Amino acid sequence: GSHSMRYFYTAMSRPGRGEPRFIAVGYVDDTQFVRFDSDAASPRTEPRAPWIEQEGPEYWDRNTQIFKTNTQTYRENLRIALRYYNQSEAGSHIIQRMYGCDLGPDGRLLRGHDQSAYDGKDYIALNEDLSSWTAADTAAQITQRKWEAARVAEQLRAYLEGLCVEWLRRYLENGKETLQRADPPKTHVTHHPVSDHEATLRCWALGFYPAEITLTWQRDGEDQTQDTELVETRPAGDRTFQKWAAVVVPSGEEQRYTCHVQHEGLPKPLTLRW
Amino acid sequence: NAGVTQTPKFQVLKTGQSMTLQCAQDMNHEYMSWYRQDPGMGLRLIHYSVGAGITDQGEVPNGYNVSRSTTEDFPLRLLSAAPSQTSVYFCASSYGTGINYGYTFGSGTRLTVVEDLNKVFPPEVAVFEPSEAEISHTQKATLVCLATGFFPDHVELSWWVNGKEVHSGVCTDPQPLKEQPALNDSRYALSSRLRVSATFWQNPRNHFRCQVQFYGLSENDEWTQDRAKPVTQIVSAEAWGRA
Amino acid sequence: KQEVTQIPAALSVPEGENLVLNCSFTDSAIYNLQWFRQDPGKGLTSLLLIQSSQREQTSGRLNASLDKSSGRSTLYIAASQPGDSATYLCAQLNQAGTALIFGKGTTLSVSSNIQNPDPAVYQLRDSKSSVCLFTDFDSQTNVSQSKDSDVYITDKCVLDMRSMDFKSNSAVAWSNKSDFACANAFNNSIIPEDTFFPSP
């Protein structure tokens, strides 16, 4: 239902091993479709999804030229932050940027985002008003003033409310074969036991997309459900996703617990046990 | 106040000299640009700066160097002067690379690079008094001014009546005429006119001044020639009532 | 790669007549089209800004259009005035937003109405350092370059006195040699004329 388009910018200083490196990656929903790397011999935007390939030369030229200017701009922003935080120029630092538009289920705009970070800590961000910034440090407040004077957010609001939404809708209809596939998950059950009055059991999920999934070990609705060891979804590298949930049950409660499987592709909730 | 201020407005260089063209704004514009206009070629991009410390080349960047240390200034240095670099240079600024806002330009800098500063010459301004037959036929006084033998084209013509300028009843040539049509160093020539009521000219207590400003060299510039250095000067001219 | 073409490159419109200036470009994903006017010595004065999303934009006597499909824009100027005469320039923004692709421009020549025509020639006091002024001529009249041989001639030009609501096209001719006492020197075309005699 909700459809997103995000562009991920990564700029990292590497003193002694080369000029800073800018990584630009675009994502629609959870699927990557464009990639830019300054360290590629011919720096240019590479297709990473089937539907984006049909695009003509001018689509690539524009994005490539923008990424190339962004490469040079964020290199100075890295130098700028050194003066703001009073850091050593020989240090290796990373600037990251998340931006894009969230689309409503009716095809109308839901939310717009432009968050920024320095060395993992949030630096600045655009509020849901698409007109004001949220500066974290005292250093970002200096930047906020500059962007407030240069009407930067205004220029960003046109993209987020215009160019972002049009092309997001464009990307969805051309690649709906894959973007709206909603491949549902799988279930496999095992039990790895210590056998000292104890045992471990695991509820699994395989080949699902999107990565949104819920795994819960309610013990026949027992008040306690949090003894379990959950792991993050791990890519199979087959363009498919895998996740397993573990629980250590005292020996003598084989089928008392009730796994809880939930995925968007499967409309009805699935409660499947051994 | 606002706008882009370009310095200088006119300048004369010889081959091999160095000079910086200054461009300043206080409109908080992060983007700045440098363009040149040559007849038949349109406006052509030289260099741009999306921000301070960032700078890239344009269509015709050879022979030009720029700097963006500050957000407010974007200078253009002519390391070595060349005859091909004779053009009008325009500086533009805008908030950034978005589509929401537009470019603002400056007045312009007319630069002429010369092989020899010897060719440079001050203007010879002259004013001719109206015809008697014109008075009877048209009831108006046609006053003509002629600036003769000035190189380069870096001049401006202004009619002052009494103590203030007049922009009414005045015609000045849009483009001068080369005294020698086929020669590059040809000293230029310009004609201007002021038409007033014949009563204004017939009254002998009114002063009209034809004044040309020439933009040339400075005291610092060398001049081993015997004639006077053609420095920036005003060559005015005067007319009083006659019957 | 990105070329902007302004055809026609010149226009001559009577006073008070509406005219259209055309501009051609290549459609991009997002861009702006801007119109400027260059008056000699004044630089570029911004007039209107249109964007790819928009189709029309109006300010006073100026209307701008944009058709993304045909890659063309028009500048409509209403109630043409003589001061509106200048070089008008159209410009598109490059794909990355780092520059403004500029056309070679189009010159506007708004012709002022010459109410009372009285073509005539007169002479002035020049011997001190022979200049004469051919003036009060028709709008259709043009000029020559005197064979480009030691004789000096300038093109036409209008001055307006709102004191008497009087517009006169004017021109000058002069030479250091006083052998010629105001020879019009116009394409050997002295035959079709009723102009006043040049001799004082």
Binding site: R62, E76, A150 | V50, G51 | -
Partner: peptide, 9 residues
């Protein structure tokens, strides 16, 4: 499509 808006810190 990427934002052409330059953000200078």
């Amino acid at each position: 499509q990427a934002s052409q808006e330059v953000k200078n810190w």
